[PDB]
Amino acid sequence: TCPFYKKIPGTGFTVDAFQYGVVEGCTAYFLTHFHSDHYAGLSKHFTFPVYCSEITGNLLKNKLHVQEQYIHPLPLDTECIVNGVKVVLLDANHCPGAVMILFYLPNGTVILHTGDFRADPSMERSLLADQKVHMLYLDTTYCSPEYTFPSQQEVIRFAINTAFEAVTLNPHALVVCGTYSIGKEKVFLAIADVLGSKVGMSQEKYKTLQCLNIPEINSLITTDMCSSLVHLLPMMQINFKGLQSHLKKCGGKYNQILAFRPTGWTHSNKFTRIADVIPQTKGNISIYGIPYSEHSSYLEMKRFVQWLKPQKIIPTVNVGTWKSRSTMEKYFREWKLEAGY
Template sequence: MRKQGRKEELVQSKYFSIDSYFKSPPNKKIKTAFQDQIEQQLSTLEARKEQCPLCCTMISVESVSMQVHVNGCLDSQQEKAGTSNETTPDCAVDSSQTAQNVETKETVMNQCDMIENVVAEDYPIENDVNDLYETILEEKGKEREGSVKIEDVTSSGVVQHNNESTVKAASGLSRILPSSWKSLFSSSSTVVTPLLQRSTNNALNPPISKQRPCPFYKRVRDTRFTVDAFNFGKISDCDGYFLTHYHSDHYGGLKSKWSHGPIYCSQVTANLVKQELRVDRRYVHPLPMNELYPIPDSNVTIALIDANHCPGSVLFLFIVKMPDGSQVRHLHTGDFRASPRMCLHPLIRQPDNPPINCLYLDTTYLNPQYAFPAQEECIHAVCELVKRELNPEKEIETKKASLLDNWIKKTPDPMNLLNPSSTPNKSRVLIVVGTYTIGKERVFFNIAKMLKCKIYASPKKAKILLCQEDEELKSMMTSNPMEAQVHVGFLRDIRGDIMSNYLRDHQTHFDSLIAFKPTGWTYKSSSSQTSDMKLAPLSHIIIPPSDRTLHISPYYDRGNIKLFGVPYSEHSSFRELASFIASLKIFHIIPTVNINQLQSMKTYFDKWEEEKLTKRIEVVAYPSLNHW
């Protein structure tokens, strides 16, 4: 009776029972049309995902978060390896590593949350994966005779069998899928073959297509040139490749074995390409700034103009001679922070110069919610904050010191009398500024200049900074971290736990730390301000804010560590983009960022162009040549 009673207590379901579950035939699945549809949708979603090569997290390849996340992981690995071309991530293939990744999920999520706040101006896509993959094959190929050679892998990922030994080594391994990151990035194996094995999961390994065609927005109209299009292999109808600046989402695909054609860029970018990517210098052609330069064997004259983005970043002004003898002018901004100085440049200013036929525009922040302050305002606010942190007593109105206090201050320390060379043990504040591989230099440079102190950066970072050929910056740098009060770090490291450990490593010379995280993503307008700006006419959008006061408060304040987010961006804000467009006569605008939002961006462009038709084109009023 007791057993029967217990049996009646079992939970009954109208869909299935425990008995029916075990009595059903093995491997038999009954699916409805709805279930088939759901599985098909899930399969489609899975096919759009790829694994991070380091933390093995599945992230959509169409999202910016994927690109930024992978870049953070790769930067971390590159830092450990010493050089970017020797990076070997340690994401294993087996399930035991996956289990370990689950255990470190909290750590990974913390890193991802931080990386998500980084502006999408330095993220590689599959080019970094291919670079690391080639490095792995090169090293493994030396260890194993008959391995697949790098030259045997075409740009489409197909292994070419050039000899019998290679055929044997690559037997059954005819394709290499960029999406199979987990297997490509194994460092535990000592042979090449496991690196090339395909996963049996078709959802994670969609069929390989032919080499991706170069997108229209990377081709310069009326020419045989492309801009920032190194990720598409050899482009058949391209006579030259232009590089706007040294950020990995722009130089992606450019590596040491480059042989597809000449690369045109600024001198600083050329220094970085040759030093960091080790590209054959015969292909790298640095061009002068602010001068018209005819490109050999072409109908194009080019001019490079400072893009106000990162060191070496430029706008490309293409002046194209047409078959009928007329000229058209195309302006490619790359990534830029728009300023009145650009619109007043002798080669761009209107009506002194003809209109811009095609404007290839950096539309990273073409959204009303991004109305962050000017760079000068951010730097001024940071410097004022540093002053307050270093001299907190000046913030408080103190009463006159008593006679006793004055006497104590004036009385010399007897220990110092015995040892004149000794100095009082003063409290010192360590200042850390987060940066990208290249970018955000103005923040730490201006702090150090104000304090008249040295700047410390890791040997790898210092080597990159020296590529700028800036003598003043060079004179301020030191290789001894204890000599410098301003240290250069990475944006991803501006976290409480990491900064706590960093201060502990330098506690012999510093007893407190303040750190800055400069990025435009830290600032967003309110929902009401955003909605008002969406409906506002161009004449209203370009009006500067009445109150330009910037207050910075810490987002982390514990003990002797304070972390500050600074709305300092090296991309144009929404208002600056509107001011730039309003200052020039432009026939066509071609966005180069957030192409999936093309229609919404076109709405702004059409509306603004309609308003411009009723007014004379002139540079929008500005308080400074450096910002609107």
């Protein structure tokens, strides 16, 4: 049955709750972003209103085949009335089309649901600054102090320099980047740009990228692999076996692969700097794991919450164990005592 943390009290609304059948008393189903754990359950046979961003709407229509009549896109940063309740969608700094939702309840309560997000100081000068938030439904993916990682700008710097150096030394090297969902497009677009290449991929992945309103996208991607020296592959193919196999297919055009695995956090984060990352090598193939995160670090999360000063926090991630829940509640209390709300 639908868990409490996907229900919005005082409304007929739910958030990211599509895998429980018809939810009793739900008049509108919100979807924060197009990631499979969140959309799980939607299909072409859904007949209830779905509220979401323009980008998320493009993906529901084209990839899941949800019918146009049930898709309700809303612009960002705009006060909108939905079934007689005022709502605003805010950029979540997660994957393309990902949003946070502000709900202004008829009784005067204000609720923020972050969806998935990577907190940024820029959110402190959005429409959030303008009034008080009583309840916060929080993306707690990395709510523990061990979780550090560098900025997205730092990680992209490392990738661009790694690739540019390798291909300038060997013009017959191929670059491959793994993907399994939307998000992290900057990794492969930034590498292709420095190499003066389009990025080549499958027809299914090109279709997905054509939904994302990225400017000048036609100039940046292609289905013709042979014209391109940056290829995308399924993340499951990023290993020595899959890559050797892939190199055979290029028909003696390249003699080296350099590959990037964008991971979330990994325990090598607790010791090693981004400057000092090293690849896994077998022969003419090298695989780099790079810590490109689209979720808040512990410090970024703590700063956001201490700025917002919510009256109540409801976690939406790591809620399945008692030890996880207890751990999070302890951090929330420290933060509140340190900052004085």
